[PDB]
Design a protein around this nucleic acid. Structure first.
Lengths: 192, 1062, 324
DNA sequence: TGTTAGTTGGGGGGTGACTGTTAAAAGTGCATACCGCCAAAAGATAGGCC
DNA sequence: GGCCTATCTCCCAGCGGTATGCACTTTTAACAGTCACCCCCCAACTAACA
């Protein structure tokens, strides 16, 4: 029901299928072992073996390429220009999704601002376990109602903790921007 | 809270481990290169040196130094310009980053050259930093390029600046011996600054305290045959002096410096005021608010472009980042706004605008660099010491020419930058043009602003179609044009170069250093073949060009002032409807089937803008003294540097200008003033001098009436051929006669002397033709001779005999052959016969007279030229032989693949700029792909059609220039003011006798030398002394040795000719 | 490099297709080049009159030899059809003439546009510069000058296969679609009457009737096929918006659009007009992603009239006579 | 000076990553052939082709 | 060498846009056990944009 190649079955490449099928073999031979060395053994095996198996796997992959060609031909007979436009739109959406995932991974793996927790955020982080409820949303609602019931006298300590965490965040932020100038993420600075 | 803080600490330490790993990990992954990263400071054989010694980093940076450490593609020159600009912009880490990125890749390492490493080595020669210099040395040896003198100079500068151990420098200088690198070669003939050689001297003095450079004190003297007398110590000489005192000339220099440091001059308009409102204030307010909005938009766009191109410089790509940091933002935006203001309603081409924007940026960079350095103060000191020779009440111990005094004093080097390569100029201009189009935005409906909220561009990109081809032009929105015309601007703006100087211009000491104080100006103003002329000029021996440089300096030293009495009358006509027959253009609004009325308004709207500009500039300089610099084209013809307010032009241009220093008339000056008036009248052209003077005495009352009442009177001066000059002479003669003493009256009015056709005079002198030397006035006679009458008679005879055949062009022209059209035809045939272009002018006269049928003009002109050509063949003898020989030599030289080259008798080399079409290259982009001819292409070959029909007039042009230069240089020693305007010589009325002597004697001394035979012996050495292809050399040798025999005419008789120049 | 008809069967079928049975036989038929002859005899035997227009004076005796009868049916005149009303200034040599004098001598007068056809022209196009001849005819048609000042004249000339294919093209075969096709398909009604190979026609040069027999082998080496075209101008061409005073702006718009073919209509309208392009293209009933290639000629006319009809704005165009 | 939006924490879910062979998409920067005729004078000459 | 063919003023002035082909880099989806995205109002912040 999808124009993209996910809905049909795409043939895995013959050499690629060899490297794929050797992985469970050495997974079973070496249970709970790291695949870091399993794939290295697979690559050593592929580099050591002669080119005749590569040639016959080329012939097999050529046959699968011909059957994939006729599948794409009948699909194009089934396809419409509106379906081509929808396919292009799905490709652009996939590009946007992978760009967003990549930039989020770059933000998380590298140094990232974790902005300070407010007074209510500190109250939630401290007193969430004490509250009792059937569902977590009910627990958050009870914590929110209790926080609204709290007076400013008890809230002064939470505001002080929020201010201290703001100070540590600001210092960590100057250190992070200095370190990231040392790393060179010119996009990861304040604009002004 | 303890657990959350502990988890935060573990993640934080993990991030420190990640950042230490990133600092440790080499940048070998392209996905990381896709992101903007830090600056980088640190094959099988290429990486052999860097693999070990860099890893075990030396504790002592002085070790591993130099030898102890043991035509371009078009893209490469862009990288070289990038590094050379990063030297000036103080961004060495950026250039180092790009260099290491290009060094890492195998595809990008090939196009790097030794100069690109040497630029960075010189960049870190300053400011110390042994580490980076050692790293660049490692990279150079990885590439394999053996180091040169400049690398050793950079290392010496570094150790001198950091003042490290002298034993290490002595070890460095025990190296570089046993090799050919001589030490004195560092200090001369290598382009490095004075601070660089000072630091190298500081190093060498600690190494070798006995190292002294050779002084080379005395300069040489020209000592050629024709220029021996002007450079001779034994003689009596009285050099002229300016009338103003030293303090005034000291104050004018500051005004000129303040005018040239800024790049603009604002001049009040001479248009009639519009002080009544008539809703011009609404337009004026809308202009202001829009022009501030555009300024803010341009600043924002510039900052965004710079922040994008910096990221483009990162990730290892070339871009134009250092070029946009060469100037401040406000100056770039101001230049763009000035360019948008001076935009015609029709629009201009994209490539023209682009170029304009690139040239202006380079000029402002050159001017600003001298401000950030100290050359301005040195120029002030040298100028104030120099002004003693050119001023009154200030005496020099010995008399000498201004160039000799300039160089006798210690002169600053005044180093200048080499020009940018062409692709960088084109891309920078295109980028700024794109910014201008995509930044400016304007309301759609201006009459009703609240009704519409749509925003449209100011400038539109459109195509103009001609034949198959399309030209992309930029056109303003018509509402903007209507708004501009509806408001009245009280101010026009000029550049500093386009305005006359307010101080004596700087002397000509070299083909690069010259007229303007800070702006750069070249001797030869040729776009075609621009590099070859300059290379020939810098190649020649140093003493060759003193005559031309001294003559140009003398022409530049002349002081000028404005004749305001003529100016008042001209602007009186200008502000009214005006009179178009005298020369003042009428307004387009007065003028009125639709296409005709559209075109007639267009042409006068074209002319009136130029008239307005000249009149406004003249009113600006109404009460001031000013100087006009000069230069020369490839033929030797001398032209002023300002484009429109040069003293050349029409009658109204020459009427407003006169001398600033006055000399008494003497016993005989007033007779010369009367003869000049009769000469400008246009009558009595066939009469002796005494008849002219008697006629002037008979028309005394008429000239007095024309002087006292110019417009209300009988209007005699309008009937003259050139009215305004006649009016000026009328005023001067009236003031002279109404004085008490006719002598001892100071006159500031130029007097003109000119031959009929100097080309024919030079042909007659070369061939020694008796008939020609009688036809033009080289033989003494009591009555003048006129060539144009004889040519007109011969053409009339040929036309009359052709008319009987029934040819239409012969019989249509009856009663129409006049002196003026014959004059224009002869001037076209003799001078500027290259690619016949006076035909248009030849058309104009035939169109101007009303009796002629207009539709027959096009066939008529093409006829007339042929006839006069034949006439000039019939009358003159030596002209035929000389033209035939020059044409044949040009043909046979051009067939061999060589452009025509020769040397003037004064030592100036001349080469011809005619070549076939070059390979045109294109630049792609967003708005448009642009195409440009690439100058200096080797594959260009001679154009035989243009290199054949060009040789005979160009040689005569060079002879004209030589004669004028000799006359100027020999009139300087007698204390005379000399000006050269077109074919005319201008001098004060008192001295026109003695000048008339000199102008004859030099003509006898230039033509007493083998002009033709020296060509015969020089062209064979230059062209016919090659053994590579003797097949055509054997044929060309005879015609190169075939010089026409002279006739029977005594040249010395020209000394006694009294109508030779009249 | 000229050609005529010298056979008898081909002259016969051309004579029969030139004149239809309902059409009036005394309707004046102008032959743009009779040549040596042969064809004109067939036209005389058909029954209609002839006005002969021969460029070369050399044939003028033989053409005068026929028509010894005083009926005036032959009426040979010396001029050239394509050099009629020369725009370039100069003396009108006997090959060049003015349409006014020629049609005064013929005795023909003016007839309004919404009326029956005055004349009929048979002839042939030049071997080189068919584009230039078609462009000059279009300039004479859109602004009523030269021949087209009096009534609504047809032409029945011959054309080559390349120029024929470049004309009459549309979306569907999109590659050859260009400006001259649009202006001719709006200007008149086009039909095809007859097609022949080039070998049937004679071949002629300046020295004589072309004697090279291997030039027939060059004719087969080119293998060019010739078409006969009927071009009858349309009655409703001159709409209130598209007038003889407004035709140059239409030509500029077409040349601007067919320059930079791959772009959309909106992108070109951004340069052409200050008004909104989305409004115009939704008003005519079409979409933004449309290319200029797949746009029919009547939508080009409708676009021009839609721009022209608006009276809200003072400035609707960026074409002044400066661009000329 | 007024308006925007994405982070800071909540849990469950699905969805994609870290270890890697395969082998072709896929992207860049050049060089070059080919459309457009927007309509338009006469004569002498030089080059190119047979 | 001899016949015939193509061209000309302004130097200014310069032409743009499509489609094809070819030496070279990068660079991704396919399989999976198991931990990162993304959500939710609460309020606050607030740098950034207009």
């Amino acid at each position: 029901s999808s124009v993209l190649a996910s809905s049909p079955k795409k043939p895995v490449s013959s050499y690629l299928r060899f490297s794929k099928e050797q992985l469970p073999i050495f997974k079973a031979q070496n249970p709970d072992a790291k695949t870091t060395e399993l794939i290295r053994r697979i690559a050593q095996r592929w580099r050591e073996l002669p080119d005749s198996k590569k040639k016959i796997y080329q012939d097999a992959y050529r046959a699968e390429w011909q059957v994939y060609k006729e599948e794409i031909s009948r699909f194009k007979e089934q396809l419409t220009p509106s379906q081509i436009m929808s396919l292009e739109k799905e490709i652009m959406d996939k590009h946007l999704k992978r760009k967003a995932m990549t930039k989020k991974k770059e933000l998380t793996l590298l140094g990232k601002p974790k902005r300070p927790r407010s007074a209510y955020n500190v109250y939630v982080a401290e007193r969430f376990q004490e509250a009792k409820g059937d569902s977590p949303q009910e627990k958050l609602k009870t914590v929110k109602e209790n926080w609204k019931n709290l007076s400013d006298s008890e809230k002064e300590l939470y505001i002080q903790h929020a201010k201290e965490d703001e100070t540590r965040y600001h210092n960590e932020m100057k250190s992070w921007e200095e370190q990231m100038i040392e790393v060179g993420r010119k996009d990861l600075l304040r604009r002004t | 809270w303890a657990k959350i803080l502990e988890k935060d600490k573990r993640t934080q330490q993990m991030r420190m481990q990640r950042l230490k790993a990133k600092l440790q990990m080499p940048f070998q992954s392209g996905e990381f290169k896709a992101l903007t990263r830090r600056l980088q400071v640190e094959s099988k054989q290429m990486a052999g040196c860097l693999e070990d010694c860099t890893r075990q980093a030396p504790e002592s940076p002085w070790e591993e130094q130099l030898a102890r450490l043991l035509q371009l593609s078009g893209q490469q020159q862009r990288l070289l310009a990038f590094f050379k600009c990063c030297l000036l912009t103080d961004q060495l880490p950026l250039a180092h980053h790009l260099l290491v990125v290009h060094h890492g890749q195998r595809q990008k390492r090939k196009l790097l050259t030794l100069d690109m490493y040497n630029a960075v080595m010189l960049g870190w020669a300053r400011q110390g930093a042994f580490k980076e210099l050692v790293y660049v040395l490692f990279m150079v040896k990885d590439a394999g390029l053996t180091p040169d003198l400049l690398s050793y100079a950079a290392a010496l500068q570094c150790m001198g600046r950091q003042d490290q151990d002298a034993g290490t420098i002595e070890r460095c200088l025990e190296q570089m011996s046993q090799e050919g690198l001589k030490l004195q070669a560092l200090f001369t003939a290598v382009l490095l600054s004075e601070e660089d050689r000072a630091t190298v001297l500081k190093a060498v003095h600690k190494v070798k305290p006995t190292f002294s450079l050779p002084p080379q004190l005395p300069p040489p003297v020209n000592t050629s045959k024709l220029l021996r007398d002007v450079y001779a110590k034994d003689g009596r000489v009285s050099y002229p002096k300016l009338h103003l005192p030293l303090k005034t000339l000291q104050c004018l220099f500051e005004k000129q410096l303040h005018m040239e440091l800024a790049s603009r001059v604002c001049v009040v308009s001479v248009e009639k005021p519009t002080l009544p409102s008539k809703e011009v204030k609404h337009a004026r307010k809308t202009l202001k608010t829009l022009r501030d909005q555009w300024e803010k938009a341009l600043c924002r766009a510039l900052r965004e472009t710079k922040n994008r191109l910096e990221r483009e410089v990162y990730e290892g790509r070339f871009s134009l980042y250092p070029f946009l940091c060469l100037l401040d933002e406000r100056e770039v935006v101001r230049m763009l706004l000035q360019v948008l203001q001076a935009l015609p309603a029709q629009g201009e081409s994209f490539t023209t605008l682009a170029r304009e924007l690139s040239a202006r940026t380079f000029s402002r960079h050159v001017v600003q660099r001298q401000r950030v350095s100290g050359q301005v103060q040195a120029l002030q000191n040298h100028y104030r010491k120099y002004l003693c020779l050119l001023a009154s009440d200030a005496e020099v111990p010995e008399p000498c020419l201004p160039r000799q005094y300039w160089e006798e004093l210690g002169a600053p080097e005044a180093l200048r930058e080499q020009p940018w390569p062409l692709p960088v100029q084109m891309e920078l201009g295109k980028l700024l043009a794109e910014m201008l189009v995509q930044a400016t935005q304007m309301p759609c409906s201006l009459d009703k602003p609240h009704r519409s909220s749509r925003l449209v561009p100011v400038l539109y990109h459109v195509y103009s179609f001609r034949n198959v081809q399309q030209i992309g032009i930029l056109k303003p929105h018509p509402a903007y044009v209507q708004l501009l015309e509806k408001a009245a601007e009280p101010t026009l703006t000029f550049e500093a170069v386009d305005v006359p100087m307010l101080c004596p211009p700087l002397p000509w000491t070299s083909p690069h250093s010259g007229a303007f104080l800070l702006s750069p100006t070249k001797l030869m103003r040729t776009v075609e073949g621009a590099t070859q002329h300059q290379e020939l000029l810098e190649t020649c021996p140093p003493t060759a060009l003193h005559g031309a440089l001294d003559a140009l300096t003398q022409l530049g030293n002349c002081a000028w002032r404005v004749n305001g009495r003529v100016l008042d009358l001209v602007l009186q006509l200008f502000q009214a409807k005006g009179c178009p027959q005298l020369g003042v253009p009428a307004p387009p609004s007065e003028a009125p089937e639709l296409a005709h009325c559209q075109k007639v308004a267009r042409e006068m709207h074209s002319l009136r803008a130029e008239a307005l500009y000249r009149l406004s500039l003249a009113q600006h300089l109404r009460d001031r003294v000013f100087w006009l610099p000069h230069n020369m084209d490839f033929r030797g013809r001398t032209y002023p540097c300002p484009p429109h307010f040069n003293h050349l032009g029409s009658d109204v241009a020459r009427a407003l200008l006169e001398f600033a220093q006055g000399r008494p008339l003497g016993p005989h000056g007033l007779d010369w003033l009367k003869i000049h008036l009769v000469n400008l009248t246009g009558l009595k052209k066939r009469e002796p001098l005494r008849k002219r003077l008697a006629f002037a005495e008979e028309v005394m009352d008429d000239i007095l009436d024309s002087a006292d009442q110019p417009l209300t009177g009988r209007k005699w001066w309008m009937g003259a051929e050139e009215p305004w000059q006649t009016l000026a002479c009328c005023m001067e003669v009236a003031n002279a006669v109404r004085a008490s003493d006719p002598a001892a009256y100071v006159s500031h009015l130029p007097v003109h002397q000119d031959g009929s056709c100097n080309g024919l005079q030079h042909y007659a002198a070369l061939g020694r033709d008796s008939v020609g030397a009688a036809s033009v006035n080289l033989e003494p006679s009591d009555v003048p001779q006129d060539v144009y009458s004889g040519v007109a008679a011969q053409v009339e005879v040929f036309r009359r005999q052709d008319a009987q055949r029934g040819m239409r062009v012969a019989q249509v022209l009856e009663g129409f052959i006049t002196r003026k059209v014959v004059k224009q035809t002869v001037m076209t045939v003799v001078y500027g016969v290259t690619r016949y272009g006076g035909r248009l002018q030849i058309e104009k006269r035939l169109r101007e007279l009303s009796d002629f049928p207009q539709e027959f003009v096009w066939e008529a002109s093409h006829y007339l030229v042929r006839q006069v050509f034949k006439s000039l063949q019939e009358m003159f003898s030596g002209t035929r032989a000389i033209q035939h020989w020059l044409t044949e030599s040009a043909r046979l030289i051009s067939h061999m693949g060589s452009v025509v080259e020769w040397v003037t008798p004064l030592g100036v080399p001349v080469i011809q700029p005619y070549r076939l079409d070059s390979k045109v290259k294109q630049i792609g982009g967003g708005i448009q792909s642009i195409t440009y001819t690439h100058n200096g292409d080797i594959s260009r070959k001679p154009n035989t059609r243009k290199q054949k029909n060009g040789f005979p007039p160009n040689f005569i042009h060079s002879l004209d220039s030589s004669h004028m230069m000799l006359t100027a240089l020999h009139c300087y020693r007698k204390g005379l003011t000399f000006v050269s305007v077109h074919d005319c010589y201008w001098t004060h009325a008192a001295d026109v006798s003695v000048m008339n002597q000199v102008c004859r004697e030099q003509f006898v001394r230039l033509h007493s030398e083998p002009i033709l035979q020296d060509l015969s012996r020089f062209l064979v050495k230059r062209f016919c002394s090659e053994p590579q292809k003797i097949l055509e050399a054997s044929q060309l040798k005879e015609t190169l040795q075939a010089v026409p025999k002279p006739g029977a005419f005594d040249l010395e008789q020209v000394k006694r000719s009294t109508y030779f120049f009249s | 490099f000229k050609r005529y008809v010298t056979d008898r069967r081909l002259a016969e079928t051309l004579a029969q297709i030139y004149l239809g049975k309902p059409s009036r036989p005394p309707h004046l038929l102008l032959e743009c080049n009779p040549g040596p002859g042969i064809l004109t005899q067939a036209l005389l035997e058909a029954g209609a009159k002839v006005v002969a227009l021969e460029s070369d004076k050399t044939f003028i005796p033989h053409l005068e030899s026929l028509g010894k009868n005083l009926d005036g049916k032959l009426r040979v005149i010396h001029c050239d059809f394509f050099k009629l009303d020369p725009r370039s200034g100069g003396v009108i040599k006997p090959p060049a003439m003015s349409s006014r004098g020629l049609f005064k001598n013929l005795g023909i007068e003016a007839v309004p546009w919404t009326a029956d056809i005055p004349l009929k022209v048979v002839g042939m196009f030049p071997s080189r510069g068919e584009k230039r001849a078609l462009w000059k005819l279009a300039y004479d048609l859109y602004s009523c000058t030269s021949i087209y000042k009096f009534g609504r004249i047809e032409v029945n000339m011959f054309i080559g296969e390349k120029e024929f294919q470049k004309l009459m093209a549309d979306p569907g075969n999109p590659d050859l679609y260009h400006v001259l096709s649009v202006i001719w398909q709006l200007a008149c009604e086009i039909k095809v009457l007859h097609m022949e190979p080039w070998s049937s026609f004679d071949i002629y040069t300046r020295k004589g009737p072309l004697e090279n027999p291997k030039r027939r082998e060059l004719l087969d080496q080119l293998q060019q096929k010739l078409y006969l075209i009927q071009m009858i101008p349309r009655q409703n061409l001159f709409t209130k918006n598209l007038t003889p005073m407004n035709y140059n702006i239409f030509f500029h718009l077409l040349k601007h659009c067919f320059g930079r073919r791959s772009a959309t209509v909106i992108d070109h309208l951004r340069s052409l007009t200050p008004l909104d392009a989305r409004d115009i293209l939704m008003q005519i009933g079409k979409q933004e992603d449309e290319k200029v290639v797949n746009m029919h000629p009547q939508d080009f006319k409708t676009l021009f009239e839609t721009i022209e009809r608006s009276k809200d704005c003072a400035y609707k165009w960026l074409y002044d006579e400066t661009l000329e």
